[PDB]
Amino acid sequence: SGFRKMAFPSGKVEGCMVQVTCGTTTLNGLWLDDTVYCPRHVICTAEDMLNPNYEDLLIRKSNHSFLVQAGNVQLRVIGHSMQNCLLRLKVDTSNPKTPKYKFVRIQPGQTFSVLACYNGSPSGVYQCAMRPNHTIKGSFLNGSCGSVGFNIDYDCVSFCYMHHMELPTGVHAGTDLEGKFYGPFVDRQTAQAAGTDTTITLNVLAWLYAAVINGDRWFLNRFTTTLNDFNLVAMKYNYEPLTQDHVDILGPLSAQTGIAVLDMCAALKELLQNGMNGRTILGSTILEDEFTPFDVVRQCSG
Amino acid sequence: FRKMAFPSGKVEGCMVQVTCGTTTLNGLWLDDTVYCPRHVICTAEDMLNPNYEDLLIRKSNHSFLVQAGNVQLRVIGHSMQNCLLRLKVDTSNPKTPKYKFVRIQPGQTFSVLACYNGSPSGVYQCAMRPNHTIKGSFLNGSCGSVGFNIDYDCVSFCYMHHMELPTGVHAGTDLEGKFYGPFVDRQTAQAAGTDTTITLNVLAWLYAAVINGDRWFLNRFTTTLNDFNLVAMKYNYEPLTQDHVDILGPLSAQTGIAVLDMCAALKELLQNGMNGRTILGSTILEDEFTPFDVVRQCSGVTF
Amino acid sequence: XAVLX
Amino acid sequence: XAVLX
């Protein structure tokens, strides 16, 4: 079947992207039904960015302080309110392209699709994973903000991310669609830093199973390991501790390939200790961790 | 620097499900025409070496069931064009975007909207390999899936999926039904020629690296085109031509680094490795980003 | 060994 | 250190 890092088709999300301006700041907003969601920092100026008091900044705005545009058409704002780090603007007209959707706060290690936008227009779509330290290793330029992360299950779009900033290390942070930041960050230009990050062990194993269902078994061995002994080694390599739930999650893939979870762990263990000796797995030269077990069983043949 | 695909909304609006007898796959609906792989008129045991021409004769418009969402699209015409079928329907697709059909060349990339039963399931970036195959990801029922590029507001359809080769790679046609490579749509014994690394794209990627501010690999020297090819061809790199040099002009101008200077830098990278260092966070030299993709991603191009 | 999709 | 997007 082959193996690609694919994103969900982005069309359902494209039809919700609008432009939102306040003062001289413009960024992206998400338009669903009669509401537009966007990062509350759209209300700041250049001097507000260091110690903004959003509450104080917002009370000084009216509905006509917000300019929302769908393409070249202006959408009138008839209401506004702040929810955590987002602004909820009510508009007098409804988005007919609004898909079935829900707001979900994903878990670290979980994957999602991002539709990077600039001035309310789609630029590109890529798939990534919420890092264990809550940051995203994305690709955002200035004016990206407002862009969203999402997953699609059938015809229902699950929105899980909205962009707000870049951390000194070049990685990115944001919130769920309720405005709550993912990670210990705040939306202000202050010295902030991501916590230590780890490789998502659950995903590497899902991926190794991807290589196997795909006909590749070179990295397997005749050993086995206990959960404890596997973790004692994996932790040495900065890998997320593997739990019994994680092993269960791998149950389906396990039964599909005939390789016990602990035996696959034994294989991973060896790979960590001896490198790949120049070989590749699914074309890759390093252990890949942005594929959840779910992504694996979805992209690969049952 | 993520491998970004084009926003796929415009192509999602053109996907439909096409069923002939027991065979179902995807179709591309533009205006009042639906394009799909001709092998859709084939049955189980009729794919070793089907005589498409004689197999089509025994078909009529009523043989084709075209569905969009939950609505049935009435087929009022059918003709074969090389390896595709062109079904005429009684309804012009209301979501037809401005578009064109173009035949992609080796090395160039495009986005693939993988579909099943007419419903888009995923989109990823691909590169037409020098051996005329693509390292894609397709399962059963994906055929008629399409590859494309967006230039401004115009959707450029360049690929339609038909087969998977024994090495796990994929083959298909342009939207005229002509295959890329020497492949044919029959389950015979066919093999992809050996592949090479797309030198042009690697150079482009190195520029992206520099543009991003990741420039440690740069050096004080330069090289001749000939001396570079002699080295690159050991690591199985496609020979670099003057035409490639010229295609890299805009990036070279943006960074002020002459192509042969970057080649000197690439050369040193091939003969000495990266020393555990990383370029754009990668430990290998990427070859599926073209000079255009680089411009597109670094410039925030929108559609 | 080619396989039609 | 942190940049608002």
Numbering used by the authors:
A (entry chain B): 1 to 302
B (entry chain A): 3 to 305
C (entry chain C), D (entry chain D): 1 to 5
What did the publication describing this PDB structure actually write?
From this round of modification, two inhibitors designated as N1 and N9, and a more efficacious derivative named N3, were identified with fast in vitro inactivation of all CoV Mpros tested, including those of TGEV, HCoV-229E, FIPV, HCoV-NL63 (representatives from group I); MHV, HCoV-HKU1 (representatives from group II); SARS-CoV (related to group II); and IBV (representative from group III) in preliminary inhibition assays. Another derivative N3 with benzyl ester exhibited improved inhibition, which could be seen from inhibition assays of FIPV and MHV Mpros. Its co-crystal structure with SARS-CoV Mpro indicated that the bulky benzyl group extends into the S1′ site, possibly enhancing the Van der Waals interaction with 25-Thr and 27-Leu. (C) Surface representation of SARS-CoV Mpro (blue) in complex with N3 (green). Compared with N1 and N9, N3 demonstrated more potent inhibition on TGEV, FIPV, MHV, and IBV Mpros with kobs/[I] ranging from approximately 4,700–47,000 M−1•s−1. Despite the high multiplicity and single-cycle infection conditions, N3 displayed potent inhibition against HCoV-229E, FIPV, and MHV-A59 with individual IC50 of 4.0 μM, 8.8 μM, and 2.7 μM, respectively. Moreover, 500 μM N3 only displayed 28.3% inhibition of cell growth, suggesting extremely low cellular toxicity. These results demonstrate that N3 is a particularly promising lead compound for further development.
